[PDB]
Amino acid sequence: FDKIYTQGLNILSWLKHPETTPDQDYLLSVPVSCPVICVIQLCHYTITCKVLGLTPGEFRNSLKWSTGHSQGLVTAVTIAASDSWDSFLKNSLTAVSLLLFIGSRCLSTYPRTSLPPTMLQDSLDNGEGRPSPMLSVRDLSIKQVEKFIEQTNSHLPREKHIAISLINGARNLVLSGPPESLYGFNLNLRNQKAPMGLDQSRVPFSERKLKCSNRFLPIFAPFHSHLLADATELILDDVKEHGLSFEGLKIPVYDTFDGSDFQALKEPIIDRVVKLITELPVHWEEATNHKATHILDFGPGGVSGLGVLTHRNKEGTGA
Amino acid sequence: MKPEIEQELSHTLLTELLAYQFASPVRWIETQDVFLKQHNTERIIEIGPSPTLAGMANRTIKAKYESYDAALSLQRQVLCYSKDAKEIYYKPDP
Amino acid sequence: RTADTNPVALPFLYKYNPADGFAPILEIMEDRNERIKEFYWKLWFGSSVPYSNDINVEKAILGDEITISSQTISEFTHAIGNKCDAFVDRPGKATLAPMDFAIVIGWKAIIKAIFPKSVDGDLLKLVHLSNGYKMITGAAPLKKGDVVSTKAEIKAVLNQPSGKLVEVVGTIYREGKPVMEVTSQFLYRGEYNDYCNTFQKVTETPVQVAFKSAKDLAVLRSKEWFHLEKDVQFDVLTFRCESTYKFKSANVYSSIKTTGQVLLELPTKEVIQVGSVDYEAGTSYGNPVTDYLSRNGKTIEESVIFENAIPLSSGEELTSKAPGTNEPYAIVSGDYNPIHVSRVFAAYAKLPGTITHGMYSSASIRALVEEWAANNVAARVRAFKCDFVGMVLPNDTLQTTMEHVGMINGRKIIKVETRNVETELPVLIGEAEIEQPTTTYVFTGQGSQEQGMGMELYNSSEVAREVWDKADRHFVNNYGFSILDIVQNNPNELTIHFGGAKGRAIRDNYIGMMFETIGLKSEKIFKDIDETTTSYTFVSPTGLLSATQFTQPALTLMEKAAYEDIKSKGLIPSDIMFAGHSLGEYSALSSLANVMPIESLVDVVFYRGMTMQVAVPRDELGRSNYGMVAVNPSRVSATFDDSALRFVVDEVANKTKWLLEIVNYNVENQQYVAAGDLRALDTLTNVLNVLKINKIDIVKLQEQMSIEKVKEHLYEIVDEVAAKSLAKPQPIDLERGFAVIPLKGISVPFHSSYLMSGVKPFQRFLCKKIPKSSVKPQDLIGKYIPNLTAKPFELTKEYFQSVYDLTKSEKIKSILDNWEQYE
Amino acid sequence: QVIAIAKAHPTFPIVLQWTGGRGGGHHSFEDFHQPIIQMYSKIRRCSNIVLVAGSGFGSDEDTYPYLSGYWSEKFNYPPMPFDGVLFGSRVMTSKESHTSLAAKKLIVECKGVPDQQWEQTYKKPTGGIITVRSEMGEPIHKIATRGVMFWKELDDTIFNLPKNKLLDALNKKRDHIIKKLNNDFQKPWFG
Numbered sequence A: 001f002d003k004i005y006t007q008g009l010n011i012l013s014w015l016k017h018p019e020t021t022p023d024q025d026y027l028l029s030v031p032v033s034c035p036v037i038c039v040i041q042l043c044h045y046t047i048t049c050k051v052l053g054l055t056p057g058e059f060r061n062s063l064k065w066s067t068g069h070s071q072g073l074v075t076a077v078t079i080a081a082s083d084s085w086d087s088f089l090k091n092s093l094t095a096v097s098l099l100l101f102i103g104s105r106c107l108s109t110y111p112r113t114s115l116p117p118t119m120l121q122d123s124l125d126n127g128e129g130r131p132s133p134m135l136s137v138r139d140l141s142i143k144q145v146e147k148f149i150e151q152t153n154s155h156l157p158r159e160k161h162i163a164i165s166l167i168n169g170a171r172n173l174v175l176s177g178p179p180e181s182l183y184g185f186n187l188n189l190r191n192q193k194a195p196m197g198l199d200q201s202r203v204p205f206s207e208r209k210l211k212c213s214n215r216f217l218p219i220f221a222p223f224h225s226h227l228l229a230d231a232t233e234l235i236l237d238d239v240k241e242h243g244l245s246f247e248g249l250k251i252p253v254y255d256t257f258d259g260s261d262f263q264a265l266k267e268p269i270i271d272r273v274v275k276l277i278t279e280l281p282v283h284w285e286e287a288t289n290h291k292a293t294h295i296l297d298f299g300p301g302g303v304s305g306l307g308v309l310t311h312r313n314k315e316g317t318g319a
Numbered sequence B: 001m002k003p004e005i006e007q008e009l010s011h012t013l014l015t016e017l018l019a020y021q022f023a024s025p026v027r028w029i030e031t032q033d034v035f036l037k038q039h040n041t042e043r044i045i046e047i048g049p050s051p052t053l054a055g056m057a058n059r060t061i062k063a064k065y066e067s068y069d070a071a072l073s074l075q076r077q078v079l080c081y082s083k084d085a086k087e088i089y090y091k092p093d094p
Numbered sequence C: 001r002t003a004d005t006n007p008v009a010l011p012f013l014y015k016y017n018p019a020d021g022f023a024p025i026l027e028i029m030e031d032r033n034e035r036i037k038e039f040y041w042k043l044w045f046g047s048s049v050p051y052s053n054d055i056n057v058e059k060a061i062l063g064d065e066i067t068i069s070s071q072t073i074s075e076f077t078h079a080i081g082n083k084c085d086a087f088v089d090r091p092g093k094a095t096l097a098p099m100d101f102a103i104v105i106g107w108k109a110i111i112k113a114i115f116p117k118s119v120d121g122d123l124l125k126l127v128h129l130s131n132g133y134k135m136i137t138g139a140a141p142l143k144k145g146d147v148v149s150t151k152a153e154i155k156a157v158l159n160q161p162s163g164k165l166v167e168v169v170g171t172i173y174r175e176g177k178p179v180m181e182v183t184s185q186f187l188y189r190g191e192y193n194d195y196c197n198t199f200q201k202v203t204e205t206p207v208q209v210a211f212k213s214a215k216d217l218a219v220l221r222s223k224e225w226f227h228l229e230k231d232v233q234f235d236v237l238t239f240r241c242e243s244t245y246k247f248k249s250a251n252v253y254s255s256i257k258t259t260g261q262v263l264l265e266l267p268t269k270e271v272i273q274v275g276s277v278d279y280e281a282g283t284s285y286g287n288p289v290t291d292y293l294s295r296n297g298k299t300i301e302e303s304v305i306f307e308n309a310i311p312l313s314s315g316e317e318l319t320s321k322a323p324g325t326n327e328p329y330a331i332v333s334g335d336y337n338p339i340h341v342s343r344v345f346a347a348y349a350k351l352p353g354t355i356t357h358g359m360y361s362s363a364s365i366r367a368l369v370e371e372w373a374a375n376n377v378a379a380r381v382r383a384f385k386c387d388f389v390g391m392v393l394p395n396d397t398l399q400t401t402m403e404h405v406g407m408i409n410g411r412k413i414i415k416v417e418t419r420n421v422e423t424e425l426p427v428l429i430g431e432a433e434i435e436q437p438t439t440t441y442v443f444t445g446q447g448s449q450e451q452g453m454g455m456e457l458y459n460s461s462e463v464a465r466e467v468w469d470k471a472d473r474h475f476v477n478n479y480g481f482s483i484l485d486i487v488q489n490n491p492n493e494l495t496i497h498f499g500g501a502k503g504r505a506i507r508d509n510y511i512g513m514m515f516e517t518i519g520l521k522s523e524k525i526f527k528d529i530d531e532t533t534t535s536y537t538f539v540s541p542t543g544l545l546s547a548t549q550f551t552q553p554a555l556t557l558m559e560k561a562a563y564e565d566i567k568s569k570g571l572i573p574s575d576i577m578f579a580g581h582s583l584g585e586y587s588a589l590s591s592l593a594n595v596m597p598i599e600s601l602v603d604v605v606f607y608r609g610m611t612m613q614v615a616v617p618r619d620e621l622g623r624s625n626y627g628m629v630a631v632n633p634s635r636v637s638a639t640f641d642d643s644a645l646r647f648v649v650d651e652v653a654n655k656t657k658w659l660l661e662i663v664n665y666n667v668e669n670q671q672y673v674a675a676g677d678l679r680a681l682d683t684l685t686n687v688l689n690v691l692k693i694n695k696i697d698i699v700k701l702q703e704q705m706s707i708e709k710v711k712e713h714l715y716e717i718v719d720e721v722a723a724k725s726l727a728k729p730q731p732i733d734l735e736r737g738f739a740v741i742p743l744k745g746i747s748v749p750f751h752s753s754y755l756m757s758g759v760k761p762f763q764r765f766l767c768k769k770i771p772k773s774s775v776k777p778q779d780l781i782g783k784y785i786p787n788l789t790a791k792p793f794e795l796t797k798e799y800f801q802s803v804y805d806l807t808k809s810e811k812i813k814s815i816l817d818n819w820e821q822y823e
Numbered sequence D: 001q002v003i004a005i006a007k008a009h010p011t012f013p014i015v016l017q018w019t020g021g022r023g024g025g026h027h028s029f030e031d032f033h034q035p036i037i038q039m040y041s042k043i044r045r046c047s048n049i050v051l052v053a054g055s056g057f058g059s060d061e062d063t064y065p066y067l068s069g070y071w072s073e074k075f076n077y078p079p080m081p082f083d084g085v086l087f088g089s090r091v092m093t094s095k096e097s098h099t100s101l102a103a104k105k106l107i108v109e110c111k112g113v114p115d116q117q118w119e120q121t122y123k124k125p126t127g128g129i130i131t132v133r134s135e136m137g138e139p140i141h142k143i144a145t146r147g148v149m150f151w152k153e154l155d156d157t158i159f160n161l162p163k164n165k166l167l168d169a170l171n172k173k174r175d176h177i178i179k180k181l182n183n184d185f186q187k188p189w190f191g
């Protein structure tokens, strides 16, 4: 994919010589963002395992189950399939290749377009972030978000419809679609939204306006949408030609969409993981609905990462 | 048609149009539809002392072309000389 | 990294001289440039293509025919970092290619122009100084599936103190028609004295010279280089010339040859060659033709520069970072110059490093301009020129500043300046011409005639001053009043005096204005003005600005002045759609078509206003029995639509036999205007009020009952309401209904069939005041949209028949009957 | 504030009697559930707070979801059991209550509404109950009797006006106010 990797993908040179790092845009590009985020997660897992002095399988045996949000499902599968250090390295390379192909074919299927700058600057001044194919809404119910989605979609054709992509929680959703459609959703929501700092203590609750954080996420592909549906077959061809697959799972790895454990799955692990990454939305509550007293967030972002979101979802559930 | 015949035809037709517009209805609904739909005009500047046709064009756009503009991702800017002289002259406040 | 992937070696030969150990290495300069040229030929064209440097500079260089593909477009766009949606493959949108793909198409032809033996220099020391693109007028952008062929011509080869400058223009052609021009400058650093091989072909931009004086014609005829082949009378000429300079020294021209075609626009509007320019000279220090046209002529599309530059975007959004490697751009663009990708070649060239492509920097900054200046619309950016004033290494941070600084023929001029953040030195300096968004120019009719309108523009702008002054002088000379006085002061009464020769001419002007009515009875507009009258007084309770005859010229003139200020500032796109409401049509035509001079325009609008004023009978108090109201269906009910108003209006007219018709179709189901007798207008007002009270849905009545039953009910309402109208003492004063708002101060039912009687004198007046020479059909076809037809002006039999269906005019009947000759 | 008191006194029980705006008498503008969802974890962080539910409880079937905590699953939240339930308007019709027999019968006649439309008391009566404005500016839920109706009209047309306009407004509506005070309100015109 030399056509896609202009500035290269030599992460070692970027780490050792920061002056040679590509720009933030290229780094956030999906063909680069996916494998590098996988590398970050695998490095975190390796650091934990080696600091505590256990092999990957030894650490895995301490885990009741694992799962992942968007591309993290690949890393969850890798740690589930990893027993020794050599097997862990094999699984890490397999996952890196898989996510590289996922990002490359997703970018090819849906090239990153630039929104008009009047809309970009209006969103930035409004605080909605830079327009992108993924828009995170918060503090609204599924019914309310669905109503606004119908309001936006009734004015658009099928190919530009907005779809629910990540049901992170009751009060946390991500909508995927054209950035123009997501900006229209944002403007409609703003028209129906509370003014910044409005005092509504002496106002009826049903007459109170909406307090929510609609912000574009820094993701440059419409992940978990029909727009990337055509990329699934291409990624399947890539993985079957490269002989990439996972096997020998030793802990449950619960599906993001239907919640089923991957150990019981009969179809190929990589086929199903690609299908979830590209087409099916993510039911995070259903995925994480199983028993857990302690949860380890290995993803990126730290405070802004998936861990704090899972804490909000499971607050007071003993996890 | 040679240019001279073409000029003769244009002069005759324009004279008749102006003469009978005196005593025929003004079809502003249809004219708004022409340059909003067929031409897909974005910058609708009305040159006048008050934003009369700016308001009427905005009303027509909201009534009939609200979904059309969204579908085509077309941003229509309606400007009035008496109000948006800065925007028409490209003279934003420094 | 070659075109054919086969490695190519660049041998440097050095004689070893052990006798002189101080300098024992002597580079063989013989054929060194030819060896380097063979190396660069193998790089750019491949090893298989034979090396041939016997290229004639005077002959255009023919490039290969290339078919544009979605894969190529996507690869190039991603290489340059362009994220415009116009270049991604959306089905059913005709994916376009970036203007920067022009260099990809024309790289072979453009770069083949520095190889000729007459142009000798060190390619390793070659630097790209500047690159620019110009879209041809009316040429669509490049799109997928386009078969494009490039023709390159060497415009100039000069020796400057910095080196040998080579100018190459590559014109791209689609289906044999030129689409765009790509101008590139390459500088061979060093010292060159071969002035025998230098030349400069300069196509001078068309210069419009106005000869409004016998001395202007005298100087033009005294020019020996100017020859007249067609003996005609002209007031403006357009000189299009192609100078050709040959240098014997740096400051001396061996030979200057200027050939050109001088053109005249006839009153027919056909452009013909009245003469030629043919200047020859030997040793010379300048071109007299260019000097004369520059001093005594203005170029077409003058660049009007804003007083204050408008900064676009910001230093955070416009920042960029050069790629770590230049291979992705080199492979897509075909520029395999080793200076950008090989450390050893850059070191030999004594460059700081593997400098990134100047053309890549151009493409990135042009993508920024595409986004921010042109709103991410690719067809709007028509020209983009840049100067490579600095060198950029991989991973450098660049800060770009864009300023909207001027306009040219309604195209925004965007000055772009890229500097290096680390060093703050400039790397790119360029300008872009970008079309404005697709524009329609709407002009408004009567309704707003406040005192002092347009006076701010009158005081601020010289051109508005000129418009108002010409109009005021014509009014004072031919009608005896000052429209500026009327607009500024709005007097209630104004006395015109007819004394003197000029006053008697003014009296004759007033006497000659006829008007027609139904007895066609024709009589003077001013019955009381005769040969014996000394003066005439205009009166108005609400000021003379509210009178039609003075409202129309004032509004027309303020609109004309506003448009003239806009045009003089250069904010009028070439592709416009101008329309006017009622009176606004005359202002729009005199504005964009220039069909009416200012004087004829004020005459026509004044005559129209007086014709409206006198078209209706009036009592001893001046009160007329007609009028106009503005009716809103949505106020009556949500289900009440335009068809429902049309049905209601037709039935009210047909039952009581009183004139009542829809005159203005303003907004669908939200704003209409009905004109007629005050009888029938109050009839409609109370009819709609009672209809809203009864909650009758005439649409359902028609859809679920015979028209006889719908007629029974509506006619019953009409009889009761018309009886009430007749009961109200005449003349009936309208009252604001829920949907009906009477138009205060309007006493004439214009735009209705009542004025069909008065059309005919106005037709003759228009024929007199519109010279056939003033009509430019190219400024009307597809741009003029009348109110009569509400479709673009077209010289088609369908359009003429549409006009005939409304007017039944004898002239249009003749044209339609004899269209066979016009076919 | 209550959580601050509880943290200041970790050993002393503090009953937090949460009541939504739907409760009788003086009431807040807040929904019964939304503040609880955000602050219940912070409340439960203190082991001395005893969280009691109120504002709209009169029977076992409608109170048990809050006691057990299954009320929260309808909001896609984990169970949020309450430590107790307080009863207000339910017990005014009791035998030992001193409320008049006619008042009790009118209370029984009032049908009430579910939680989805308790907030439309602010505009019109709702199962025989309307919101009026007190002397202090707080809202009070009261049965839609004729006196309470006139209270509502006076809040909407008289007491909302500024002081500088109140006197002239009262003078303009002098006769109507007296007539309806004598006919409909508990405090007749003395004159």
Ligand SMILES: Cc1cc2nc3c(=O)[nH]c(=O)nc-3n(C[C@H](O)[C@H](O)[C@H](O)COP(=O)(O)O)c2cc1C
Residues within 6 Å of the ligand: D019, D022, D023, D024, D025, D026, D054, D055, D056, D057, D086, D087, D088, D089, D090
């Ligand atoms: C007649 C009446 C008087 C009340 N008085 C008070 C009071 O004085 N102080 C207080 O904090 N709450 C008071 N309340 C509110 C109740 O204590 C309780 O929080 C509320 O009525 C619960 O609403 P519910 O009846 O729908 O269950 C009163 C309620 C009613 C109906």
